[PDB]
């Protein structure tokens, strides 16, 4: 019924970027994580703040549109300008390609940080199903779904039941 980031995304998660889905006794539900989305957003915002900034070097005109400059100096200026344009076109294409690769890998990394943190938090009380979800073998209510959502979950008081359900 529900699947995680391994096979598909979750259309409908309007508030935030990262979150949890639940299949509880009360049925299906969705909630935002809020911390991981804000971390990813802060990092992307930082990247944009570094790249989306204007320079401080003012450039003057060295040619003239109305009256053409001398052919030898005009051709040297045009060659230098075209080589600079090639350098900045290369730098812009490379910058956008690595920043898109870093943004995508960053977001998948943040999804993974949330996933490993939840795995470490659940310890032996949950087992991976291979689709980005954790199958929990101790019957746990909404108060305990919320305990999983934030960093308040305590391994104690579920270990014996989850192990007996797994063994």
């Amino acid at each position: 019924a529900i699947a995680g980031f391994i096979e598909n995304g979750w259309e409908g998660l309007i508030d935030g970027w990262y979150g949890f889905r639940h299949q509880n006794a009360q049925g299906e539900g969705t909630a935002a994580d809020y911390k991981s989305t804000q971390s990813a957003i802060d990092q992307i915002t930082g990247k944009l703040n570094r790249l989306i900034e204007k320079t401080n070097q003012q450039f003057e005109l060295i040619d003239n549109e109305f009256t053409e400059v001398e052919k030898q100096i005009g051709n040297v200026i045009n060659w230098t300008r075209d080589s600079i344009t090639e350098v900045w076109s290369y730098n812009a294409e490379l910058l956008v390609a690595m920043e898109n690769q870093h943004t995508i890998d960053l977001a998948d990394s943040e999804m993974d940080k949330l996933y490993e943190r939840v795995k470490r938090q659940l310890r032996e009380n949950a087992e991976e199903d291979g689709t980005g979800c954790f199958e929990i073998f101790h019957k746990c209510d909404d108060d305990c779904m919320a305990s999983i959502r934030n960093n308040t979950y305590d391994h104690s008081k579920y270990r014996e039941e989850a192990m007996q359900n797994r063994i």
Binding site: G4, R21, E60, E93, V96, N100, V118
Partner: protein, 316 residues
Amino acid sequence: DKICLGHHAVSNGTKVNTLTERGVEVVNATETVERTNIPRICSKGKRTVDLGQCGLLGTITGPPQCDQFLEFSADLIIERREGSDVCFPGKFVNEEALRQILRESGGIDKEAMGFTYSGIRTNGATSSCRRSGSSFYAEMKWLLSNTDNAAFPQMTKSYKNTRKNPALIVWGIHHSGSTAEQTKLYGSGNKLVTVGSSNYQQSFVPSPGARTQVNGQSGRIDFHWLMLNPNDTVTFSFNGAFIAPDRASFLRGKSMGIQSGVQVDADCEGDCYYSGGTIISNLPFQNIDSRAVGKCPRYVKQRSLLLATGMKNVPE
């Protein structure tokens, strides 16, 4: 019970170029290459001189069409395609260096040189430049050799620059358009003009041949210029065809000059300009004008580059 971790998605996202794959769909992305512009010049908070019917160099020699801009003060100088630097036909040597100096000049602060002449007609009226009747450049004196055919004495004149800033000194050489006209206007004989200073030296000879008639006249004025260091002196020596300066041009400070074909909109703020308008954007790149002047984004060949502002799109 089961919990699933994951991320949001949209039904229709946007595509970005990554290192290994050309079309990765992402939830969100923004442009890094600016393509939008405003057809008007954004010049708010800056002193702007709209040099209509007048070029940058016309503010030095003073053709009638530039009379209001002789002592202009500006932070932004806008040169127009329909304008001209020269009214009586002619041109400058090293036009580009002088225009580059004027664009950064901060405006022009002129002071009279104090040259007094006697036995010389200083009218120099020409039908190609008019204010009323026939009137030559306001700021240049065309030293005719008195009555027709009279000899022109070999005069020596000098100007000392006493200010902290260097002086821009401009003069011309008159090419009469014929030897009959040079003999009539400046008298008979060969003419020579020399210019000296500590770090500049030159000589010029008139060329009274024959030229294509432009704006009613076949002669041409070749304009020359000198940058004079503080506390130095420029000395001119001439047998005629000197077209003497009346005032030296000093630099007011710093500015930036632009070329533009569109009207000025003084309620818009920006600091980088191009021929067809202004580019107001904080994006790192542009695809508008490869020779734009000012603090504009860096020009790239690509029409559009999308930098992802969100993760990858997994449609379900």
